[PDB]
């Protein structure tokens, strides 16, 4: 059977980056020719692997992580980056082995009055670890007094909304991102190419 990459790339709804979605891909033949022969991607950067030479490799597991961020922020989905997205939403390791794929989705993820269904984490005491997913909504304590789950001064809701409107500049328009992680453990390799 063929790997369900279509379910990830062509999904109707994408996740907010703070609650990024992960699809675990196993026991299937992966046809990567569908991806690198597509003229619909604006970002296609791979680390520790060649895209065209991917059909000749077997891996134990493949992970497909997907979410929506700003075009300004696609540069943060890479090893060794800092910023609100890399620090507090989605973090790649230094030794990352995989591919980061992105494309403009302003036609889908922006509404006339402004789309607010897409959120990102703005406040967090410390940086995320690689592949860490934080979905907490706890009120953030920016000062001395405890918040007790009530908003107010020095007590902020940790998530912020993107303002995706069609009139935004490219760097502020929504982009859908798919991160492929390639994992080679001391187990049977279940994801190969042709």
């Amino acid at each position, epitope marked *: 059977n063929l790997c369900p990459f279509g379910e990830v790339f062509n999904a109707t709804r994408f996740a907010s980056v703070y609650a990024w979605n992960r699809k675990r891909i196993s026991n299937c033949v992966a046809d990567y020719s569908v991806l690198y022969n597509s003229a619909s991607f604006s970002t296609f950067k791979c680390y520790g692997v060649s895209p065209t030479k991917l059909n000749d490799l077997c891996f134990t597991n493949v992970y497909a992580d997907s979410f929506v961020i700003r075009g*300004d922020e696609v540069r943060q989905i890479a090893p060794g980056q*800092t*910023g*609100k997205i890399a*620090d*507090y939403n989605y973090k790649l390791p230094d030794d990352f082995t995989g591919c980061v794929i992105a494309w403009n989705s302003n036609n889908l993820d922006s509404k006339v009055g*402004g789309n607010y269904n897409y959120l990102y984490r*703005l*406040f*967090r*005491k*410390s*940086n995320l670890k690689p592949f860490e997913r934080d979905i907490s909504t706890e009120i*953030y*304590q*920016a*000062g*001395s007094t405890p918040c007790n789950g009530v908003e107010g*001064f*020095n007590c*902020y809701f940790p998530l*912020q909304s993107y*303002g*995706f*409107q069609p*009139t*935004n*500049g490219v760097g*502020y328009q929504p982009y859908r991102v798919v991160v492929l992680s390639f994992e080679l453990l001391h187990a049977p390799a279940t994801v190969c190419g042709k």
Partner: antibody
Amino acid sequence: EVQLLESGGDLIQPGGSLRLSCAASGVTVSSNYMSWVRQAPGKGLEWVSIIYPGGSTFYADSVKGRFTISRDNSKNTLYLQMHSLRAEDTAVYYCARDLGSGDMDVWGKGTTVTVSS
Amino acid sequence: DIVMTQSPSFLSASVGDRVTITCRASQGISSYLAWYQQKPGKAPKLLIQAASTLQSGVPSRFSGSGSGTEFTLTISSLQPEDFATYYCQQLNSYRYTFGQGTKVEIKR
């Protein structure tokens, strides 16, 4: 109450070094987006540097490679270390708390830096 | 990058007037805009964030609105303490870009 008290501004020659301090009360520096913003005599506001609650730092292009922002948790204090100062660095320097998006609600009174030969 | 053009540089108004300051971005920034007020010798004061959220404690006079590429600060009824310089700032940007500032002065 809530206040930011900065100090360390002085008259210094070009190529000199200076450290500005910003002692905070009512706000926890390590838990906040904290920035330095400067204002040259008779000009507008210019953002200088920021340190995220998680520790990441970023700089304006005009000061990159010369200024360093840091903080001391035990002293609840923000710092701006300046090296290789130039005449155009002359300004009043404010420390400010950033609510997250760049909108700064808590400002200090400012400290004055003059760089001249 | 995105250039913030703030107009006018100088504005003369009278006590009780309705004042309109304009900040134009070189391309769409949604609602990512803040407004500041600064008086001579004092630190700036945050008035409105996110283009239409009056900061707590700021009097009801100050009104912020606008979306996309044209934004406005509106002082519905100018009071003596409102003669000052006002600054817009692009929010959620790598550059933290400020406008050039608008000085509101006493009409005669």
